[PDB]
Motif scaffolding. Structure first.
Motif, PDB file in Angstrom:
ATOM      1  N   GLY A   1       3.149   4.981 -12.531  1.00 32.38           N
ATOM      2  CA  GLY A   1       2.992   4.627 -13.922  1.00 32.38           C
ATOM      3  C   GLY A   1       1.713   3.838 -14.176  1.00 32.38           C
ATOM      4  N   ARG A   2       1.407   3.663 -15.460  1.00 34.98           N
ATOM      5  CA  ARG A   2       0.257   2.872 -15.876  1.00 34.98           C
ATOM      6  C   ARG A   2       0.515   2.304 -17.263  1.00 34.98           C
ATOM      7  NH1 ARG A   2      -5.080   6.495 -14.106  1.00 34.98           N
ATOM      8  NH2 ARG A   2      -4.668   6.500 -11.849  1.00 34.98           N
ATOM      9  N   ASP A   3      -0.151   1.194 -17.561  1.00 31.23           N
ATOM     10  CA  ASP A   3      -0.046   0.530 -18.849  1.00 31.23           C
ATOM     11  C   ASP A   3      -1.231   0.920 -19.733  1.00 31.23           C
ATOM     12  OD1 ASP A   3      -2.184  -0.848 -17.814  1.00 31.23           O
ATOM     13  OD2 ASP A   3      -1.134  -2.760 -17.592  1.00 31.23           O
ATOM     14  N   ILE A   4      -1.313   0.307 -20.917  1.00 33.51           N
ATOM     15  CA  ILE A   4      -2.421   0.578 -21.826  1.00 33.51           C
ATOM     16  C   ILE A   4      -3.752   0.160 -21.223  1.00 33.51           C
ATOM     17  CG2 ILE A   4      -3.412  -0.006 -24.068  1.00 33.51           C
ATOM     18  CD1 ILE A   4      -0.515  -0.327 -25.093  1.00 33.51           C
ATOM     19  N   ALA A   5      -3.733  -0.745 -20.248  1.00 33.54           N
ATOM     20  CA  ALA A   5      -4.942  -1.228 -19.594  1.00 33.54           C
ATOM     21  C   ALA A   5      -5.332  -0.398 -18.378  1.00 33.54           C
ATOM     22  CB  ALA A   5      -4.770  -2.693 -19.183  1.00 33.54           C
ATOM     23  N   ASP A   6      -4.622   0.698 -18.108  1.00 31.74           N
ATOM     24  CA  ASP A   6      -4.863   1.531 -16.933  1.00 31.74           C
ATOM     25  C   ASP A   6      -4.539   0.796 -15.637  1.00 31.74           C
ATOM     26  OD1 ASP A   6      -5.609   3.614 -18.553  1.00 31.74           O
ATOM     27  OD2 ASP A   6      -7.768   3.337 -18.268  1.00 31.74           O
ATOM     28  N   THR A   7      -3.639  -0.181 -15.708  1.00 31.73           N
ATOM     29  CA  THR A   7      -3.165  -0.913 -14.542  1.00 31.73           C
ATOM     30  C   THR A   7      -1.709  -0.548 -14.292  1.00 31.73           C
ATOM     31  OG1 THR A   7      -4.688  -2.755 -14.934  1.00 31.73           O
ATOM     32  CG2 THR A   7      -2.778  -3.172 -13.526  1.00 31.73           C
ATOM     33  N   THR A   8      -1.409  -0.115 -13.070  1.00 35.70           N
ATOM     34  CA  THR A   8      -0.067   0.356 -12.752  1.00 35.70           C
ATOM     35  C   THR A   8       0.908  -0.815 -12.733  1.00 35.70           C
ATOM     36  OG1 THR A   8      -0.935   2.214 -11.469  1.00 35.70           O
ATOM     37  CG2 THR A   8       1.330   1.522 -11.035  1.00 35.70           C
ATOM     38  N   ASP A   9       1.938  -0.743 -13.576  1.00 34.04           N
ATOM     39  CA  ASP A   9       2.982  -1.758 -13.609  1.00 34.04           C
ATOM     40  C   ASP A   9       4.189  -1.406 -12.748  1.00 34.04           C
ATOM     41  OD1 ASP A   9       3.924   0.335 -15.080  1.00 34.04           O
ATOM     42  OD2 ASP A   9       4.513  -0.842 -16.836  1.00 34.04           O
ATOM     43  N   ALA A  10       4.279  -0.174 -12.256  1.00 31.40           N
ATOM     44  CA  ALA A  10       5.400   0.236 -11.422  1.00 31.40           C
ATOM     45  C   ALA A  10       4.984   1.449 -10.604  1.00 31.40           C
ATOM     46  CB  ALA A  10       6.642   0.549 -12.263  1.00 31.40           C
ATOM     47  N   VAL A  11       5.707   1.676  -9.506  1.00 30.65           N
ATOM     48  CA  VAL A  11       5.422   2.781  -8.600  1.00 30.65           C
ATOM     49  C   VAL A  11       6.734   3.313  -8.047  1.00 30.65           C
ATOM     50  CG1 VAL A  11       3.119   1.956  -7.990  1.00 30.65           C
ATOM     51  CG2 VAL A  11       5.099   1.220  -6.650  1.00 30.65           C
ATOM     52  N   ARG A  12       6.699   4.559  -7.584  1.00 34.01           N
ATOM     53  CA  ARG A  12       7.850   5.219  -6.989  1.00 34.01           C
ATOM     54  C   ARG A  12       7.678   5.286  -5.479  1.00 34.01           C
ATOM     55  NH1 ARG A  12       8.609  11.216  -8.775  1.00 34.01           N
ATOM     56  NH2 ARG A  12       6.834  11.445  -7.339  1.00 34.01           N
ATOM     57  N   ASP A  13       8.742   4.967  -4.756  1.00 30.83           N
ATOM     58  CA  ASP A  13       8.699   4.976  -3.301  1.00 30.83           C
ATOM     59  C   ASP A  13       8.339   6.369  -2.797  1.00 30.83           C
ATOM     60  OD1 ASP A  13       9.327   3.654  -0.634  1.00 30.83           O
ATOM     61  OD2 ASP A  13      10.760   5.318  -0.594  1.00 30.83           O
ATOM     62  N   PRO A  14       7.257   6.523  -2.029  1.00 22.81           N
ATOM     63  CA  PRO A  14       6.904   7.857  -1.519  1.00 22.81           C
ATOM     64  C   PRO A  14       8.011   8.513  -0.715  1.00 22.81           C
ATOM     65  CG  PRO A  14       5.073   6.342  -1.240  1.00 22.81           C
ATOM     66  CD  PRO A  14       6.246   5.511  -1.680  1.00 22.81           C
ATOM     67  N   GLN A  15       8.950   7.739  -0.169  1.00 17.27           N
ATOM     68  CA  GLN A  15      10.033   8.301   0.626  1.00 17.27           C
ATOM     69  C   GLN A  15      11.313   8.380  -0.197  1.00 17.27           C
ATOM     70  OE1 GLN A  15      10.572   6.333   4.373  1.00 17.27           O
ATOM     71  NE2 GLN A  15      12.247   7.671   5.039  1.00 17.27           N
ATOM     72  N   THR A  16      11.932   7.234  -0.457  1.00 15.92           N
ATOM     73  CA  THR A  16      13.133   7.194  -1.276  1.00 15.92           C
ATOM     74  C   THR A  16      12.773   7.309  -2.755  1.00 15.92           C
ATOM     75  OG1 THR A  16      13.092   4.774  -1.336  1.00 15.92           O
ATOM     76  CG2 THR A  16      14.357   5.822   0.428  1.00 15.92           C
ATOM     77  N   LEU A  17      13.726   7.810  -3.538  1.00  9.55           N
ATOM     78  CA  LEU A  17      13.537   7.986  -4.974  1.00  9.55           C
ATOM     79  C   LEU A  17      14.073   6.752  -5.692  1.00  9.55           C
ATOM     80  CD1 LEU A  17      14.565  11.740  -5.369  1.00  9.55           C
ATOM     81  CD2 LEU A  17      12.252  10.784  -5.305  1.00  9.55           C
TER      82      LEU A  17
ATOM     83  N   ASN B   1       0.860  -1.179   0.000  1.00  2.00           N
ATOM     84  CA  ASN B   1       0.000   0.000   0.000  1.00  2.00           C
ATOM     85  C   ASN B   1       0.897   1.230   0.000  1.00  2.00           C
ATOM     86  OD1 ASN B   1      -1.757   2.129   0.464  1.00  2.00           O
ATOM     87  ND2 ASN B   1      -3.043   0.979   1.899  1.00  2.00           N
ATOM     88  N   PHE B   2       0.846   2.005  -1.081  1.00  2.00           N
ATOM     89  CA  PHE B   2       1.672   3.196  -1.246  1.00  2.00           C
ATOM     90  C   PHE B   2       0.755   4.406  -1.369  1.00  2.00           C
ATOM     91  CE2 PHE B   2       5.125   0.430  -3.404  1.00  2.00           C
ATOM     92  CZ  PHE B   2       5.463  -0.082  -2.168  1.00  2.00           C
ATOM     93  N   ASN B   3       0.818   5.301  -0.383  1.00  2.00           N
ATOM     94  CA  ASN B   3      -0.004   6.513  -0.349  1.00  2.00           C
ATOM     95  C   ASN B   3      -1.464   6.081  -0.437  1.00  2.00           C
ATOM     96  OD1 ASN B   3      -1.296   8.952  -0.817  1.00  2.00           O
ATOM     97  ND2 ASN B   3       0.410   9.826  -1.986  1.00  2.00           N
ATOM     98  N   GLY B   4      -2.220   6.497  -1.450  1.00  2.00           N
ATOM     99  CA  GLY B   4      -3.605   6.089  -1.574  1.00  2.00           C
ATOM    100  C   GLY B   4      -3.803   4.962  -2.565  1.00  2.00           C
ATOM    101  N   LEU B   5      -2.726   4.249  -2.881  1.00  2.00           N
ATOM    102  CA  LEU B   5      -2.759   3.142  -3.826  1.00  2.00           C
ATOM    103  C   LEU B   5      -2.478   1.832  -3.102  1.00  2.00           C
ATOM    104  CD1 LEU B   5      -2.938   2.043  -6.726  1.00  2.00           C
ATOM    105  CD2 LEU B   5      -0.482   2.487  -6.944  1.00  2.00           C
ATOM    106  N   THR B   6      -3.225   0.793  -3.465  1.00  2.00           N
ATOM    107  CA  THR B   6      -3.067  -0.523  -2.866  1.00  2.00           C
ATOM    108  C   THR B   6      -3.093  -1.579  -3.961  1.00  2.00           C
ATOM    109  OG1 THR B   6      -3.863  -2.036  -1.143  1.00  2.00           O
ATOM    110  CG2 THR B   6      -5.518  -0.934  -2.505  1.00  2.00           C
ATOM    111  N   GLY B   7      -2.582  -2.754  -3.630  1.00  2.00           N
ATOM    112  CA  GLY B   7      -2.542  -3.849  -4.575  1.00  2.00           C
ATOM    113  C   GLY B   7      -1.613  -4.943  -4.097  1.00  2.00           C
ATOM    114  N   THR B   8      -1.513  -5.981  -4.924  1.00  2.00           N
ATOM    115  CA  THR B   8      -0.673  -7.137  -4.640  1.00  2.00           C
ATOM    116  C   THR B   8       0.191  -7.436  -5.854  1.00  2.00           C
ATOM    117  OG1 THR B   8      -2.291  -8.086  -3.104  1.00  2.00           O
ATOM    118  CG2 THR B   8      -0.622  -9.567  -4.016  1.00  2.00           C
ATOM    119  N   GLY B   9       1.493  -7.560  -5.633  1.00  2.62           N
ATOM    120  CA  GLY B   9       2.411  -7.848  -6.720  1.00  2.62           C
ATOM    121  C   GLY B   9       3.821  -7.991  -6.195  1.00  2.62           C
ATOM    122  N   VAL B  10       4.741  -8.227  -7.127  1.00  5.61           N
ATOM    123  CA  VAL B  10       6.157  -8.386  -6.819  1.00  5.61           C
ATOM    124  C   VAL B  10       6.869  -7.090  -7.179  1.00  5.61           C
ATOM    125  CG1 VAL B  10       8.262  -9.663  -7.313  1.00  5.61           C
ATOM    126  CG2 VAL B  10       6.074 -10.872  -7.163  1.00  5.61           C
ATOM    127  N   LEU B  11       7.548  -6.496  -6.199  1.00 11.31           N
ATOM    128  CA  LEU B  11       8.272  -5.248  -6.400  1.00 11.31           C
ATOM    129  C   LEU B  11       9.672  -5.556  -6.918  1.00 11.31           C
ATOM    130  CD1 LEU B  11       7.212  -3.287  -3.183  1.00 11.31           C
ATOM    131  CD2 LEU B  11       6.324  -3.010  -5.508  1.00 11.31           C
TER     132      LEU B  11
END
Lengths: 264, 106, 242
Positions: free
Chosen positions: C226-242, C202-212
């Protein structure tokens, strides 16, 4: 404050055309190598925008309706434009937003302001020791009831008067939704005489200000100088346009930036 | 409007001003009894006279609130002691000579 | 706020507006630096999970026995004629013994109070008027005399005074939720990160299950997700570290 400049000559608000202007990154979602279609407040392509100019014989500082959203394109040399002032009454009657650039930092505050007929930040007594720094503040005499305050990072902006073609282009988008006032900014150098350059531009997000107020009108804050009827201004030009709910198809490159946009 | 409201007001402001002067008067006597010094002997007289003259100044304003118009029992009891003028009723000579007899006999 | 050297008088109490920051209340409750701590309408443990738009911190000094008069729908001299809490007040109360600072040898008269007023003060009202109080119908005209008194009175402060009357510095926080957006919120967590494993993130207001897994893609500094053509996020940025 209440004394208008003598050299000012009122002339009609000439209109100009903007081709691709009004494109910006809608949100912070990363999208690349895809064509995305979205609908928000936009500037239609090949539409008409108004021609404004600031100089010691045409100096334009009218108040203008903000409506839903407005687009700005500014060609600057000496950086005459210090910012804009937003609000309903643009006076102490309510809370008004004020964006001022003193050449040091950008002060952004929402308070109750005492409105002057001709607000501006003056600079006096150049001669030797060329100065060119904030000296006279004519915008408002007093203020109170501040619901918001913001200050940018220190920077050095050159106010010295320049001549020749316009060497800088600053295009902004200003909008207010759900009390959140958002700014989209772009700055690039150009070589131009009048009007605007022909090319594509994609604006980037600058700041999101939760000012929580209604803005029906706006007025441009311009810088004046003399070495309040005797003030002068250098050569500067900016443009204003109204955003409409149009649908654009945005194409992204492998790096994520917008390659081109087509109005549906 | 009634004298009752005026009496209770005089009694509320009297407790605060009297509590500060009375505490300093008793505190001065404490430092004098616990330690015998030239500073404590004078503080007891200054603090003692300041509090002694306080009741004399308040007694003048206490006699201006008759108890016939006061229907509160707790209010009349507070003004019952303030209504007394102490040695003020005595003549100037009989008032000053009284303290001389008490100090001479003591 | 409570560490400030000098505090305003009960009539002079300053009102501080706190907004646009994060608030950690666990340090104040677990510090054991307060004499008495109580809240009205909101529990102390729930403050960390609640975001408030405006937080007003009241500051002033009152007598020990006078602290009991601070509460919704209270009475007394300090409550009616100085400071009063509305029945709907959702804030909290904090007090501690100032006898080691404010009270000094000889007494400190800098802290005063309003003894008399023609009526009771309204909720969240501050009146510094020094105008003479008129008990009866006898004119005053600013000259002390019969039926004319000075409303402000100084609190006697000395270290030898009883614990009950010892001065207590009180900080009253007024929690008010208005139509404006909320800013001040409780603290954060930011637990450890795990990669190359199946987990629910769970990152900020985003939640889900996957392999980081760290990739070579580069998101725009302003673009967090980020998001894919399906509007499903394939990657995220750490809210703290870059």
């Amino acid at each position: 404050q209440c004394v208008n400049l003598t050299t000012r000559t009122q002339l009609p608000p000439a209109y100009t055309n903007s081709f691709t202007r009004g494109v910006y990154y809608p949100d912070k979602v990363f999208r690349s190598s895809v064509l995305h279609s979205t609908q928000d407040l936009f500037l239609p392509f090949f539409s008409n925008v108004t021609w404004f100019h600031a100089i010691h014989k045409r100096f334009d500082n009218p108040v203008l309706p903000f409506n839903d959203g407005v687009y700005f394109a500014s060609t600057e040399k000496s950086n005459i434009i210090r910012g804009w002032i937003f609000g309903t009454t643009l006076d102490s009657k309510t809370q008004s937003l004020l964006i001022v650039n003193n050449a040091t930092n950008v002060v952004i505050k929402v308070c109750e302001f005492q409105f002057c007929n001709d607000p501006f930040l003056d600079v006096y007594y150049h001669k030797n020791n060329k100065s060119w720094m904030k000296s006279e503040f004519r915008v408002y005499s007093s203020a109170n009831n501040c619901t918001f305050e913001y200050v940018s990072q220190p920077f050095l902006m050159d106010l010295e008067g320049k001549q020749g073609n316009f060497k800088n282009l600053r295009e902004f988008v200003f909008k207010n939704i759900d009390g959140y006032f958002k700014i989209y900014s772009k700055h690039t150098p150009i070589n131009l005489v009048r009007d605007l350059p022909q090319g594509f531009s994609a604006l980037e997000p600058l700041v999101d200000l939760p000012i929580g107020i209604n803005i029906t009108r706006f007025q441009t804050l311009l810088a004046l100088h003399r070495s309040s009827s005797g003030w002068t201004a250098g050569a500067a030009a900016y443009y204003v346009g109204y955003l409409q709910p149009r649908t654009f198809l945005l194409k992204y490159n492998e790096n994520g930036t917008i390659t081109d946009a087509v109005d549906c | 409007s009634t004298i009752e409201e005026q009496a209770k007001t005089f009694l509320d402001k009297f407790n605060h001003e009297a509590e500060d002067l009375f505490y300093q008067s008793s505190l001065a006597s404490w430092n004098y009894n616990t330690n015998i010094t030239e500073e404590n002997v004078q503080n007891m007289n200054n603090a003692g006279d300041k509090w002694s003259a306080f009741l004399k100044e308040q007694s003048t304003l206490a006699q201006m609130y008759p108890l016939q118009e006061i229907q509160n029992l707790t209010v009349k009891l507070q003004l019952q002691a303030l209504q007394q003028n102490g040695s003020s009723v005595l003549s100037e000579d009989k008032s000053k000579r009284l303290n001389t007899i008490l100090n001479t006999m003591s | 706020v409570f560490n400030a050297t000098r505090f305003a008088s009960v009539y002079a109490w300053n009102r501080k507006r706190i907004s646009n920051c994060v608030a950690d209340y666990s340090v104040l409750y677990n510090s054991a630096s307060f004499s008495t701590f109580k809240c009205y309408g909101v529990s102390p443990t729930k403050l960390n999970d609640l975001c408030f738009t405006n937080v007003y911190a009241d500051s002033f000094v009152i007598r020990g026995d006078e602290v009991r008069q601070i509460a919704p729908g209270q009475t007394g001299k300090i409550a009616d004629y100085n400071y009063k809490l509305p029945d709907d007040f959702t804030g909290c109360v904090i007090a501690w013994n100032s006898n080691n600072l404010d009270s000094k040898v000889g007494g400190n008269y800098n802290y005063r109070y309003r003894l008399f007023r023609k009526s009771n003060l309204k909720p969240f009202e501050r009146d510094i008027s020094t105008e003479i109080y008129q008990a009866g119908s006898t004119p005053c005209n600013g000259v002390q005399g019969f039926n004319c008194y000075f409303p402000l009175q100084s609190y006697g402060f000395q270290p030898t005074n009883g614990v009950g009357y010892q001065p207590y510095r009180v900080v009253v926080l007024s929690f008010e939720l208005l139509h404006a957006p909320a800013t001040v919120c409780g603290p954060k967590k930011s637990t450890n990160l795990v990669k190359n494993k199946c987990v629910n993130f769970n990152f900020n207001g985003l939640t889900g299950t996957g392999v980081l897994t760290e990739s070579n893609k580069k998101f725009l500094p302003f673009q967090q997700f980020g998001r894919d053509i399906a509007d499903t996020t394939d990657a995220v940025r750490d809210p703290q570290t870059l």
